[PDB]
């Protein structure tokens, strides 16, 4: 909690107001199909 993040800052430059607590931090999602793998079994219950 004593680190304090930062970023490109979504607001603006202007700054004719009463908010200076930037404290911006971003969340980065990434995606991949990857072709993971396997593992089949047999339903022990009533066959099928």
């Amino acid at each position: 909690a004593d680190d304090i993040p930062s970023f490109q800052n979504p607001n603006d430059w202007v700054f004719p107001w009463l908010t200076q607590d930037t404290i911006q931090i971003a969340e980065f999602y990434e995606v991949v199909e990857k072709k993971e793998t396997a593992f089949i079994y047999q339903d022990p219950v009533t066959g099928e």
Binding site: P10, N11, D12, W17, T19
Partner: protein
């Protein structure tokens, strides 16, 4: 001092609401009218004199 249930006992009613600079914004209907409404009043008063 522990009060009852598991929420803040304060429900808020809004008119038009949203965020901008990431600052909270809301308003009633009246806001838009204030501008010409004084004009009305004014010209009124002027003509009264």
């Amino acid at each position: 001092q522990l009060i009852a249930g598991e929420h803040i006992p304060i429900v808020p009613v809004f008119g038009e609401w949203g965020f901008v600079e990431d600052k909270e914004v809301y308003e009633g209907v009246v806001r838009l009218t204030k501008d010409g409404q004084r004009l009305r009043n004014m010209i009124m008063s002027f003509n009264a004199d």
